[PDB]
Design a protein around this ligand. Sequence first.
Ligand code: CLA
Ligand code: CLA
Ligand code: CLA
Ligand code: CLA
Ligand SMILES: CC1=C(/C=C/C(C)=C/C=C/C(C)=C/C=C/C=C(C)/C=C/C=C(C)/C=C/C2=C(C)CCCC2(C)C)C(C)(C)CCC1
Ligand SMILES: CC1=C(/C=C/C(C)=C/C=C/C(C)=C/C=C/C=C(C)/C=C/C=C(C)/C=C/C2=C(C)CCCC2(C)C)C(C)(C)CCC1
Ligand SMILES: CCCCCCCCCCCCO[C@@H]1O[C@H](CO)[C@@H](O[C@H]2O[C@H](CO)[C@@H](O)[C@H](O)[C@H]2O)[C@H](O)[C@H]1O
Ligand SMILES: CCCCCCCS[C@@H]1O[C@H](CO)[C@@H](O)[C@H](O)[C@H]1O
Ligand SMILES: CCCCCCCS[C@@H]1O[C@H](CO)[C@@H](O)[C@H](O)[C@H]1O
Ligand code: OEX
Ligand SMILES: [Ca+2]
Ligand SMILES: [Cl-]
Ligand SMILES: [Cl-]
Ligand SMILES: [Fe+2]
Ligand SMILES: [Mg+2]
Lengths: 503, 34, 33, 39, 38, 79, 30, 172, 32, 342, 36, 63
Amino acid sequence: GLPWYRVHTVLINDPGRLIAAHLMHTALVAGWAGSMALYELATFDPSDPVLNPMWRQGMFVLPFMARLGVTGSWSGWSITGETGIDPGFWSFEGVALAHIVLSGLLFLAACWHWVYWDLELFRDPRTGEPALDLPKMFGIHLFLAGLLCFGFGAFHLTGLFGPGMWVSDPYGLTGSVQPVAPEWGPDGFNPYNPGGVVAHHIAAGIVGIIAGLFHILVRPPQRLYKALRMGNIETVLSSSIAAVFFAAFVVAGTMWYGSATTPIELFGPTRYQWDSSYFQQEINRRVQASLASGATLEEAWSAIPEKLAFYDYIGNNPAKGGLFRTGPMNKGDGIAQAWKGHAVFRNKEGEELFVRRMPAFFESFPVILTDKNGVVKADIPFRRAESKYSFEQQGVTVSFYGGELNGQTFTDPPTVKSYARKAIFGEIFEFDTETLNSDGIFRTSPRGWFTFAHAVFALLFFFGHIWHGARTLFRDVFSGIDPELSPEQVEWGFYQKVGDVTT
Amino acid sequence: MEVNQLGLIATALFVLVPSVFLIILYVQTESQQK
Amino acid sequence: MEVNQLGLIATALFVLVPSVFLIILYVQTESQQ
Amino acid sequence: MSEGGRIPLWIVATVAGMGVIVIVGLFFYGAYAGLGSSL
Amino acid sequence: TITPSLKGFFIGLLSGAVVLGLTFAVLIAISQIDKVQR
Amino acid sequence: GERPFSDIITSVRYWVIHSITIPALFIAGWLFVSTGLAYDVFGTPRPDSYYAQEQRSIPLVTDRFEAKQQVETFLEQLK
Amino acid sequence: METITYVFIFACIIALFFFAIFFREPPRIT
Amino acid sequence: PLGISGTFNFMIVFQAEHNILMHPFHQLGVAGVFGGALFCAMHGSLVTSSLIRETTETESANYGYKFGQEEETYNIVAAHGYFGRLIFQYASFNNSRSLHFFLAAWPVVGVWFAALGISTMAFNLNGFNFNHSVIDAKGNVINTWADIINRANLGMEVMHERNAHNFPLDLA
Amino acid sequence: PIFTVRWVAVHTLAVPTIFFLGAIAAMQFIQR
Amino acid sequence: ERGWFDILDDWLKRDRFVFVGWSGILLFPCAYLALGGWLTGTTFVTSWYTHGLASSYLEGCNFLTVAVSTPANSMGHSLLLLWGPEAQGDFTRWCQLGGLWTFIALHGAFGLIGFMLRQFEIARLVGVRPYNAIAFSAPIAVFVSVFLIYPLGQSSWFFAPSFGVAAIFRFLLFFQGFHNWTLNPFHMMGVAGVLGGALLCAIHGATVENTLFQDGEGASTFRAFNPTQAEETYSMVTANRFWSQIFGIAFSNKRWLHFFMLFVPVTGLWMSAIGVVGLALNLRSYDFISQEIRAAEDPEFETFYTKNLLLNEGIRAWMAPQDQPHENFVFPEEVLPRGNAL
Amino acid sequence: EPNPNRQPVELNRTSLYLGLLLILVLALLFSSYFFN
Amino acid sequence: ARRTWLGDILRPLNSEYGKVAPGWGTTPLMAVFMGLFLVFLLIILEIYNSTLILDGVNVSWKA
Ligand code: CLA
Ligand code: CLA
Ligand code: CLA
Ligand code: CLA
Ligand SMILES: CC1=C(/C=C/C(C)=C/C=C/C(C)=C/C=C/C=C(C)/C=C/C=C(C)/C=C/C2=C(C)CCCC2(C)C)C(C)(C)CCC1
Ligand SMILES: CC1=C(/C=C/C(C)=C/C=C/C(C)=C/C=C/C=C(C)/C=C/C=C(C)/C=C/C2=C(C)CCCC2(C)C)C(C)(C)CCC1
Ligand SMILES: CCCCCCCCCCCCO[C@@H]1O[C@H](CO)[C@@H](O[C@H]2O[C@H](CO)[C@@H](O)[C@H](O)[C@H]2O)[C@H](O)[C@H]1O
Ligand SMILES: CCCCCCCS[C@@H]1O[C@H](CO)[C@@H](O)[C@H](O)[C@H]1O
Ligand SMILES: CCCCCCCS[C@@H]1O[C@H](CO)[C@@H](O)[C@H](O)[C@H]1O
Ligand code: OEX
Ligand SMILES: [Ca+2]
Ligand SMILES: [Cl-]
Ligand SMILES: [Cl-]
Ligand SMILES: [Fe+2]
Ligand SMILES: [Mg+2]
């Protein structure tokens, strides 16, 4: 009989049951989307988009609904923190309901096509054998894909007939769904320009319509039909798998580096924003502008939004997690409650000292403080007997500006050392570690988890492409080579051209 | 030891679902006419 | 709700073990001549 | 002439091998002198 | 406005086309001279 | 087909040709180093060119787009 | 519960060794 | 130690105390097991590539072989003709006896050398030491990748068995 | 002038190899 | 008059000492440039400006210590094209900036594509199934995950492996100290496939060689085989009985045996590639949370797992300042973790 | 009408033993990380 | 086989199985579009990589 890894090949010459199987797969995927959204709604806390946004809570499909304009709940909240909004039917709950109903309808259609597999449509009128004209099917489906792609760009993303898409300022403070006009200049190919996303779908959509019409109306060259085995449906499986692993690598890349379609309020900040101190630079720029205008130090730091400070914290860096540290980021460091304010460290002489921040590479990191010129001025020693830079020897204090601890100063060395240990993570926050029984160990964000799954799946699908591409091009020898393979074709000197009996 | 509480069900289903898949296939192979 | 931590594995095996027993028997019946 | 076997293969192999021994020996000498010798 | 890196892009592009063009012209030329007998 | 390698390298003609070309290539490679040209083609420091006489800092490149000028500056500091 | 789980899987493996050796499909020359 | 993490502990301490990575017998060991795995995949794929057709599209090709049959089940001339063109003709084995001797010899010899590496570093004849081997004209040490290995080895050395050493040299 | 693929392949490897070996030989006499 | 494409196809597929094929148009330039780049760099090119390291024969390194090192961390994931905005056409600067690293990695990647395409092309011409090509997907998955995906998840090419013997050793130790890579179950499956593959190689070769039929009079038995012969040269029946009695189980199907020899090392390498994709994101198997909770509360609880984390912490602190020079780490002596005396 | 594309499925005893070994050993390997 | 109303409507769209254009057909044109597509991918890759840097194209969150 068929071995276990070949059971599904019974569909190769049965178009009706292949459609049924594809219907069942589609029902399962849509049901997953609906189920996933319901589970997230049952667990999502909407009360604080500043310090407990979705990406702290392990939300995976919630950001994809928000990306395209579904931002509100039938229960009255919005993911931007509004109250008393009417989202209409197309709330998070409505989207989930729609997918569950779709799943059921697809399931019923699968049953029908499985029972009534022997449709005259699937037979070649000439031979009476099962037959799919795959070249024309490609044209039909490409034309349809072009129309949907165009309409998505021209009506949905523009807001012309639809909600638009999520856009934000460069620091992810004021994101919202907005209509977006196409960008038709070279900045349309900038991955951080959302107008390029709109222009892409308009232009690529029109191209897909034109190419679709071409592939509907023009037959394949005999040379290409033969060489790509266009009568063999497994050729389509090979090149489709290749297209799909290409796409999977691309979405993994744009998720990890960031783009207009992976905004930080939906998926969390990138690792590179920590690497380049992106948020720390903007915080310092605002502080210095406040000071230049006459603000006191307390005022300058108090003018920094908690949300901005929270981005400047390594517990939100997606490169700080672990493969088996499961669940939301809140399960690790806790549910963030409030910024404690900016810690300023000084030695007994009064010089400001700066805690050396932890790089993403390091599970643990020492506590070392330098002056503005990078000279080491204090640390927490390991060996004590020859310590020279201890906080006790150097009289290190810490003062807080902004946040909960604004205006307070600590001098007790263990307390000063505890704050310094928090400062290697960037800005310091107070966390609720009890509600989830958090363990204090960093986890990655949806940005991290999406990237991992899609890079892994992309690589695995490379094998699938190779496998089915081989199966297509070597179909005649799938069960073995010619029982009487002429030694003249495999031994040297007999033929001038390899594998050519006429040479 | 404070282990993950879902570790037990995860391991149990990891063993049982594919093992049962194979047992089904084996037994219905043995029962086919010989 | 503070439910018993063993409730899940208890319910899962309670369903799965006898259910798979029946599926094994059904399938090898179908495959008989 | 292009005729093969005029120069016996065993002499070719012996001479080539000794050349290899010489060049590799020079490299080991260089490990103890000049750059890379730690001195 | 053609930036230096755009000029560099064109240099890379033409360079690659030349390598490929010459490769195929040579291969085609050799294959036309040195034909297989049937 | 082509002649076996064992026929080629045991022939007088092969060794007449290669008693000239092999030593010539060897000596050219020798001179490529012994004249110091290899240093300047590849930009490799000579033993007296890793550091200036008193400098204690390795000339690590820190700027992506002016790294070219950065190396050029590091080299003029050797004086 | 973790120790029981580890020892259970180990014990199943040892049982499988027993069946795979003594209750193998016998090699037959045809 | 007789355990999985204990094995890694043994390996890391061994690297700190013997620089085993820089020992040529361990390098031969790696060539043995990397090469053994490569030739395993190679031999497996070449014989599988040349199975003689004995089954239909829905049967496993393994049923094309009957235990104890007198005829070989694959076409070694076909396999050789493929492999000789992949590299070059003389790089391939056409003699099954030479081929299978090679498959035995390569991993066995390499692992012999692996075992002799451990058994001779057992008496503290250790891996190559190129620490500070490259020096500039004044005498500044110019680091190489060997010096970076040394920095990692030092971290292993100073931390292992953190309460056991009272005197400055770890002499066993 | 009749070249073959084998001749070309041989010399793309052999010619640089001898040149490189002369270079590495000379390096053995460099002093800091 | 057949057309130029078919004339070219003829010449490309002529039976010659080294087969060319359409795949050779990609394979031979890229493989040659990858190999030539490595030999050039390890012979002549420094790593002073990218790493503060000497790395060539010209500088005094030996075969174990030469390398073509990765570019400086400040280059990011720049393609570092010779004509690109960093080297701006200057070959000398390009070498000093690390351009040979991306040169070798990228030409090597396309060379590996060309080689697998060659395996398909030759298999199709001689009429065998392309399992050899399928087996080669494991080397490709390893190369792509380790030399491309891993650095692309990190801050820059700088943390990719550098092309050298000792440089690769450093990469191993970095992965222990920073990733606890030995604890990773995907690496463990990789180890199982490589060691199991080496085991299968040795045991199969030895078994054939010790169940040979006497097919000649020589005491050296290699000559008593003819490639065209119909009969098995060794006794499958005797081999099966021996292993059944020694080990408990034995192969009985020669086709399954050889497919299993493909399956085991190929699957192992694929699993290791998956773990490295995780490490690209620092998604490590670094800790067991239950172990850390117990150890943090109970200072008498110790396992080999906690012992190895102390080793890792030593590795990180002692190697990071010279291994990551762009970080400008200064770790005063007093902060370095050290046990007693050492 | 009966579908002519159906085929019986098979798993012989050796394959059962091989599969159970794979599953049980994978479980023995991954369970520690599931418990964490 | 079973005829249906929708099946009869769709019949012409699945009626030219195996039909081909002679010889090389539109292969040369296809090759042109493939070449253009390759260059396009190279452009967007090098813009994202900052190997190709264009006036007014700031590849950053700040644009
Ligand atoms: C006004 C015209 C217009 C505009 C403004 C856009 C705008 C855009 N296009 Mg679109 N496009 C258009 C017309 C347009 N397009 C037309 C007419 C077509 C033909 C149908 C296309 C087909 C097209 C494709 C195929 C792609 C775009 C993409 C994009 C986005 C590029 C920025 C980016 O993030 O790329 C990121 C992607 C890249 C930089 C390409 C990477 C190429 C890889 C490296 C090649 C090798 C892949 C392979 C699997 C190897 C993996 C190895 C790895 C494991 C190491 C941007 C939104 C890209 C996109 O969707 O990004 C999200 C994209 O892939 N467009
Ligand atoms: C693209 C896939 C994908 C991604 C990126 C996410 C991402 C996320 N999920 Mg979701 N989820 C998914 C699919 C996905 N999910 C599916 C299909 C289901 C139904 C099962 C769910 C059900 C789900 C629930 C119930 C929850 C999440 C949660 C989360 C968040 C934490 C995830 C975590 O801890 O993983 C941890 C990752 C692992 C432990 C990795 C598993 C590695 C496997 C076992 C390897 C197996 C190896 C194999 C056996 C070897 C074969 C070898 C052989 C071939 C030889 C994160 C945002 C959590 C959350 O916070 O929600 C608010 C949460 O509670 N997800
Ligand atoms: C669009 C994607 C796609 C599709 C439609 C197919 C379809 C097919 N494959 Mg291919 N393949 C793919 C991708 C795909 N494959 C990928 C990504 C890989 C690498 C992982 C492969 C590697 C592969 C091999 C080696 C073989 C096939 C074979 C087949 C044929 C028989 C399938 C079968 O009976 O399995 C039956 C499967 C089971 C009974 C159990 C599988 C359980 C898996 C291992 C774990 C469970 C997965 C989980 C339920 C869902 C995950 C989904 C999502 C996360 C991706 C069928 C044409 C076979 C063939 O060619 O026969 C002639 C064959 O030998 N495929
Ligand atoms: C087939 C063999 C082959 C392949 C695949 C590569 C591939 C590569 N080379 Mg190598 N190289 C080769 C042979 C090859 N090379 C040879 C023989 C030499 C010696 C001359 C070199 C010397 C070399 C150097 C010195 C460098 C490279 C570099 C590179 C990389 C960048 C190349 C690039 O961006 O080109 C871009 C150009 C193209 C892709 C050509 C496009 C041709 C298209 C298809 C024409 C179609 C036009 C279309 C119909 C109309 C569009 C018109 C347009 C104006 C709108 C890439 C990995 C660079 C590198 O590695 O950086 C680290 C680098 O610095 N190569
Ligand atoms: C019939 C009907 C109905 C109903 C419907 C429904 C109710 C449905 C549902 C559906 C559903 C409710 C579905 C679900 C699905 C799910 C799924 C499909 C899942 C899957 C999963 C997976 C595949 C996973 C995997 C994994 C794991 C487990 C671990 C980790 C790793 C991974 C991720 C791989 C209505 C009334 C409408 C009407 C019409 C008719
Ligand atoms: C990069 C580049 C390029 C290329 C170049 C090339 C292609 C080169 C080549 C080169 C070469 C191609 C070289 C070679 C060399 C070689 C050598 C250097 C060798 C040595 C050897 C030895 C030393 C041996 C040893 C041994 C062994 C191994 C084993 C046993 C025996 C004995 C011990 C003897 C171009 C221009 C395109 C562009 C720019 C960039
Ligand atoms: C939680 C674990 C759940 C896992 C669920 C596992 C699903 C397993 C489904 C296996 C289905 C097996 O499908 C079974 O195939 C066999 C042949 O192999 C069919 O059997 C058919 O073929 C055989 C042999 O030609 C005939 O003797 C038999 O009369 C005929 O009906 C059965 O009619 C079908 O029931
Ligand atoms: C207890 C030492 C003196 C006070 C030091 C406070 C550092 S900050 C402290 O850090 C904990 C870990 O993040 C958090 O859980 C908590 O919210 C926070 O208050
Ligand atoms: C290298 C790109 C491959 C594109 C192939 C296009 C072939 S084009 C094709 O070529 C034939 C020659 O073989 C001619 O007979 C024919 O007139 C011409 O149109
Ligand atoms: O035990 Mn286990 O490790 Ca051989 O060194 Mn000394 O002793 Mn202890 O230290 Mn290092
Ligand atoms: Ca607690
Ligand atoms: Cl230890
Ligand atoms: Cl001591
Ligand atoms: Fe064999
Ligand atoms: Mg020297």
